[PDB]
Amino acid sequence: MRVLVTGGSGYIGSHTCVQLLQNGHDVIILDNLCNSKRSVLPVIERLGGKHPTFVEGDIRNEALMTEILHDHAIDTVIHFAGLKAVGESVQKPLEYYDNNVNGTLRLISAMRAANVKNFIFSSSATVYGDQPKIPYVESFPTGTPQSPYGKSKLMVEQILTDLQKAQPDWSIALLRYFNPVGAHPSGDMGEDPQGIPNNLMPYIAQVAVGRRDSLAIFGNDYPTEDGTGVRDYIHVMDLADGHVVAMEKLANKPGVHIYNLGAGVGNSVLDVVNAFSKACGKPVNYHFAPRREGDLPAYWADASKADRELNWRVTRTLDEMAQDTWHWQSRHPQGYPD
Amino acid sequence: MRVLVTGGSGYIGSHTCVQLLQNGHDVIILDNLCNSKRSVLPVIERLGGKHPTFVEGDIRNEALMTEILHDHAIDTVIHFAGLKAVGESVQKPLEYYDNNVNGTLRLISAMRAANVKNFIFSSSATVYGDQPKIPYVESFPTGTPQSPYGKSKLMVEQILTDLQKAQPDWSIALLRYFNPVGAHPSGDMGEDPQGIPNNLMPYIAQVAVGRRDSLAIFGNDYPTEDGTGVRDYIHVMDLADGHVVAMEKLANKPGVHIYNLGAGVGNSVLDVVNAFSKACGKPVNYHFAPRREGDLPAYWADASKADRELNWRVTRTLDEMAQDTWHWQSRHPQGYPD
Ligand SMILES: NC(=O)c1ccc[n+]([C@@H]2O[C@H](COP(=O)([O-])OP(=O)(O)OC[C@H]3O[C@@H](n4cnc5c(N)ncnc54)[C@H](O)[C@@H]3O)[C@@H](O)[C@H]2O)c1
Numbered sequence: 297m298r299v300l301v302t303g304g305s306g307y308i309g310s311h312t313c314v315q316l317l318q319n320g321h322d323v324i325i326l327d328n329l330c331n332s333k334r335s336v337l338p339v340i341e342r343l344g345g346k347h348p349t350f351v352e353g354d355i356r357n358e359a360l361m362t363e364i365l366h367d368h369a370i371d372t373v374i375h376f377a378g379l380k381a382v383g384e385s386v387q388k389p390l391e392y393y394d395n396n397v398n399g400t401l402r403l404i405s406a407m408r409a410a411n412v413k414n415f416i417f418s419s420s421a422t423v424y425g426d427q428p429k430i431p432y433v434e435s436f437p438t439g440t441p442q443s444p445y446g447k448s449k450l451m452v453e454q455i456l457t458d459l460q461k462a463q464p465d466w467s468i469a470l471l472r473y474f475n476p477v478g479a480h481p482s483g484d485m486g487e488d489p490q491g492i493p494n495n496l497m498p499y500i501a502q503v504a505v506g507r508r509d510s511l512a513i514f515g516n517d518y519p520t521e522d523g524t525g526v527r528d529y530i531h532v533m534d535l536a537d538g539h540v541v542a543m544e545k546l547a548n549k550p551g552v553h554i555y556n557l558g559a560g561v562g563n564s565v566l567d568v569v570n571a572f573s574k575a576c577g578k579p580v581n582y583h584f585a586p587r588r589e590g591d592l593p594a595y596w597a598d599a600s601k602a603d604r605e606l607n608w609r610v611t612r613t614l615d616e617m618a619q620d621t622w623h624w625q626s627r628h629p630q631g632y633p634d
Numbered sequence: 635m636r637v638l639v640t641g642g643s644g645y646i647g648s649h650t651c652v653q654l655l656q657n658g659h660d661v662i663i664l665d666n667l668c669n670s671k672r673s674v675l676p677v678i679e680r681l682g683g684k685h686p687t688f689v690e691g692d693i694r695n696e697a698l699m700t701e702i703l704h705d706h707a708i709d710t711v712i713h714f715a716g717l718k719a720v721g722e723s724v725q726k727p728l729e730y731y732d733n734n735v736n737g738t739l740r741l742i743s744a745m746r747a748a749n750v751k752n753f754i755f756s757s758s759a760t761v762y763g764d765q766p767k768i769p770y771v772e773s774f775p776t777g778t779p780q781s782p783y784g785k786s787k788l789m790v791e792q793i794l795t796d797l798q799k800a801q802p803d804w805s806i807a808l809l810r811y812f813n814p815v816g817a818h819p820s821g822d823m824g825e826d827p828q829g830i831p832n833n834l835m836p837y838i839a840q841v842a843v844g845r846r847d848s849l850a851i852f853g854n855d856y857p858t859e860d861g862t863g864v865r866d867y868i869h870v871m872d873l874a875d876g877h878v879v880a881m882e883k884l885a886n887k888p889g890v891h892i893y894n895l896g897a898g899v900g901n902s903v904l905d906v907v908n909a910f911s912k913a914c915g916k917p918v919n920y921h922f923a924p925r926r927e928g929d930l931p932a933y934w935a936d937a938s939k940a941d942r943e944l945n946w947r948v949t950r951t952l953d954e955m956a957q958d959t960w961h962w963q964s965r966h967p968q969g970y971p972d
Pocket residue numbers: 302303304305306307308309326327328329330331332353354355356375376377378379380395399418419420421473474475476495
């Protein structure tokens with residue numbers, strides 16, 4: 297298939313592009329490079345074994361989106377582009393609503409203009425809100441996310457759902473990600489955050505590489521087995537594969553197809569730290585700090601639906617996630633080159 | 635004060651502009667004329683007794699909004715511009731999200747750019763969703779509106795709230811309207827819908843003027859006193875006055891000030907019909923049809939908060955609403971001239 301991958305040079309998108317190319321699809325990447333570098337391009341082509349076309353541009357530019365869609369005879373669009381720092385979203389809400397809500401709106405408006413009707417959206421478990429019932433199931437009603445970022449994802453899901461109702465021939469997948477971690481097994485592609493990493497895995501990796509002192513563990517008084525927060529970590533390669541399958545199986549299948557993409561099990565902060573210490577060959581330094589504002593104690597996905605309907609399930613383990621992260625971190629301590 | 639009134643040539647905005655001018659404020663109207671005519675301009679100035687500047691343009695045009703704000707040294711913005719047909723929103727969701735969500739976002743982004751920090755937003759009781767508890771109180775958590783239009787209003791309220799949190803010097807009023815009806819007492823300004831009117835009052839008026847056959851009363855089996863739906867109708871002049879007071883009293887008062895603007899009492903469809911028959915001097919023809927998809931049986935506002943905090947309450951009655959509507963309808967059967 298001919299697929300436009302917005303945000304294709306970013307963390308999740310880069311890995312997904314490699315898997316798509318490996319499956320022989322024709323890939324066009326659209327990215328504004330605000331949170332990624334052109335230096336990943338050659339890696340995607342190498343690892344993917346096929347050349348992906350790259351277009352530098354912004355999803356907010358509807359005219360350009362329309363032109364790309366038409367120009368490349370796109371059949372389906374996988375939408376990863378957006379802003380995603382939770383804390384920053386609190387500080388700079390407008391930028392989040394503009395990039396995520398308006399950005400997706402401009403993109404789907406371009407699709408309508410170009411007669412493209414297959415879409416895959418990067419959603420998040422944040423949409424479940426403060427749900428006491430765990431694991432989270434797609435049949436649960438959504439809640440109210442506590443950050444502008446989380447809200448922006450739920451708003452997009454709603455707009456997409458209304459769009460599908462109005463244009464019933466569309467096939468739209470709402471893929472709710474849990475906690476993406478890991479890196480391509482080659483150790484040559486991975487997450488390359490700029491500045492202070494906000495997520496657990498990269499933070500741990502930077503502590504391990506000797507860039508950071510100690511991992512601050514946000515809270516040790518949670519009602520969990522070891523007192524630390526519990527989450528569903530999913531290897532980026534398993535996520536990538538899930539996108540390829542969703543794209544291939546849902547194309548031209550009208551509806552709003554919602555799937556949680558997670559491992560279906562929870563792991564604590566200590567569990568993750570322990571796995572990383574093992575992977576890097578030295579104890580990861582850490583300390584206990586106060587609970588992070590708004591975090592829940594524990595949640596993970598119920599991934600039965602995707603297994604049943606798409607025959608998809610994760611295959612990489614927690615150790616692999618840690619190992620692959622360390623390999624990338626260690627092989628490319630400065631990330632992608634400028 | 636220097637106030638930019640978006641959507642100022644529309645139904646509610648025109649009346650509000652007259653009241654503002656009467657209070658000696660400097661008014662700049664911004665409207666794209668998609669649902670109004672320049673012919674109302676002269677009426678606003680005449681009835682307002684002062685000239686309001688008019689700018690033809692779209693709230694989606696951030697650069698233009700910024701320029702206007704600066705150019706006119708605006709102190710506060712009252713935002714009425716947007717799309718508001720419920721049924722159409724179901725059929726054309728994108729247009730609604732673009733005009734309402736992106737439109738407001740572009741406008742407030744322009745405000746930030748121009749250092750304007752006082753805002754008044756046209757919200758709706760639709761934000762309460764399917765709330766069994768009536769009357770509706772501002773302290774109730776919001777619900778889930780059932781149309782793209784309703785959702786778009788709740789999304790905007792959320793974005794505005796996050797914006798205020800991020801820029802705490804802002805003063806933002808979220809004015810939740812119930813059912814605006816009525817017309818200026820002069821009979822020379824009023825609601826001028828194009829095509830089939832979607833709301834009860836104008837529909838009744840068109841039946842009365844002899845344009846329409848019969849009023850279809852959506853449902854007669856509701857658990858209400860007469861079996862017809864019950865709502866909170868508020869005279870557009872009372873609404874107008876509430877906007878002037880909110881603007882004057884909340885300017886420079888940091889926070890998110892939420893107020894329901896309603897009469898605080900419910901009236902049935904029959905009650906409204908009866909009032910209109912009385913006003914026009916002939917029985918209004920009507921019949922019973924099936925319930926309208928998604929309508930609730932009965933709801934009205936709890937307007938105590940606005941009374942207490944702003945010393946505002948409605949003063950026009952249901953008969954006045956009907957009388958004023960008939961006077962306008964009858965004096966200007968073709969509405970505003972092309
Ligand atoms: N990583 C996670 O923990 C997480 C959790 C849930 C959901 N998501 C979502 O998955 C998607 C991918 O996340 P990621 O971890 O790969 O992040 P990322 O920052 O690595 O990837 C996003 C990419 O989008 C690009 N981009 C940003 N705004 C753009 C715009 N307006 N126009 C064009 N390109 C633009 C960035 O330059 C970057 O390459 C995002 O939508 C994110 O919100 C990620």
